[PDB]
A = this chain, B = another copy of it.
Amino acid sequence: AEREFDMTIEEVTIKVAPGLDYKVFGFNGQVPGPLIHVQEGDDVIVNVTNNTSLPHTIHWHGVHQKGTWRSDGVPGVTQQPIEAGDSYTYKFKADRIGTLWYHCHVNVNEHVGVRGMWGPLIVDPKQPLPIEKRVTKDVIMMMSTWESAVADKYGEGGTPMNVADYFSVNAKSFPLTQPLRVKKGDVVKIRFFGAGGGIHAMHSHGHDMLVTHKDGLPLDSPYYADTVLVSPGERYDVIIEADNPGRFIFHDHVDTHVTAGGKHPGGPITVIEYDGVPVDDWYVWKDKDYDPNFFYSESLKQGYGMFDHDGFKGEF
């Protein structure tokens, strides 16, 4: 089917951690960018308007661009950039399945590295794996890093000379992340993305993960892991069988990454919380203002197209 939608690029500010507001170039004014969910073989048309002061493009990472290389989104290679105020249309066929993503391809060290110019592109295969048919919850986790020194300074950052001192999943640093709420017998698909410039060793307490896909393609030899290393550009899909009720933290195991501005704890941390486990008064998230769509799990259930999420929106 043909799926057409409209995306903008906006100058907004998001809160990454307590105390750290960050100027970003958000697709539809949000970080992560909107979810795009389509079916294998769909024809996609994306109309992009740059409402920022700098040039950008959008590259569709994982999308082959078969016979459509001029929609690959690479400035000086496949197109001239989308200047401030201008618009550009991408057209491609979603013939490559799985967990893909999209991001700016201008000034990538800064724009992708610290300005939030990325989001998920999920292509459902015609022939999912049998285990994918058992999935009851689909979870997107996009990891990235932040350089507090350039939080207010578009046009700066993302170099070797900078210091990445904050770390996140879906643009929040613990405790501003959200729990992964499950119930016993859930079958949870988690998609990890190396969205920013860091490496993330994603470890699930209480559970092993079955690694089923690399860069959205199914492995002939899936393997179990309790820690999955995710580097820039990569995706890994896993399955967790939610058969062990408790509260089980789930986090980046790289030691410096569970800090925030040199303070601990922080960083890419969530908690697998099972329904019905009694809550101790000392539980760090006992009073959480819960967002069930923090990992796009609700959006993923609502059809094919483009989805914004108000909890990812920044301020103008």
Residues of A bordering B, CB below 8 Å = 59, 61-62, 64-67, 69-70, 72, 74, 76-78, 80, 96, 107-110, 112-113, 158-165, 194, 196-197, 199, 201, 203, 205-208, 214-217, 219-227, 229, 231-234, 244-249, 253-256, 258-259, 262, 264, 271, 277, 282-284
Given the known A-B contacts A264-B109, A271-B77, are A161 and B159 also in contact in the complex, defined by CB atoms under 8 Å?
A: no
Contact residues in B for A222 (Cβ distance below 8 Å): 220
- Across chains A and B, which 4 residue pairs bring their CB atoms closest together, nearest first? A69-B246, A197-B255, A233-B253, A227-B233
Q: Which single residue of chain B is at the shortest CB-CB distance from A243? A: B66
Name A106's closest neighbour in chain B (CB-CB).
B264
- In addition to A64-B206, A229-B231, 8 A-B residue pairs with Cβ atoms within 8 Å of each other are A108-B258, A109-B264, A110-B264, A159-B256, A159-B262, A160-B163, A217-B224, A229-B229
Partner of A284, one of B77, B109, B203: B77
Q: How far is the CA of A252 from the CA of B307 in the complex (A)?
A: 30
Contact (Cβ within 8 A) A158 B256: yes
Q: Which residues of B contact A214 (CB under 8 A)?
A: 223-225
Q: How many copies does the complex hold?
A: 3
**In the assembled complex, how far is the CB of residue A22 from the closest CB belonging to chain B, in whole angstroms?**
15
Q: A226 — nearest CB in chain B belongs to which residue? A: B215
Is the CB–CB distance between A221 and B224 below 8 Å?
no
- By the criterion CB–CB under 8 Å, are A64 and B207 in contact? yes
Q: Is the interface of A mostly helix, strand, loop or mixed?
A: loop
Q: CA–CA, A69 to B272, complex, Å? A: 11
Complex Cα gap A67–B245 (Å): 7
The answer to whether A159 touches B229 (Cβ under 8 A) is no
CA distance A283 to B249 in the complex (A): 48
The answer to whether B220 and A215 touch across the interface, beta carbons within 8 angstroms, is: no
What is the distance, in angstroms, from A257's C-beta to the closest C-beta of chain B?
8
Q: How far is the CA of A112 from the CA of B254 in the complex (A)?
A: 10
Tell me, in angstroms, the Cα distance from A208 to B212 when the chains sit together. 17
- In contact, A258 and B160 (Cβ under 8 angstroms): no
Check B223 against A220 for contact (C-beta < 8 Å). yes
| Chain B residues closer than 8 Å to A271, beta-carbon distance | 77
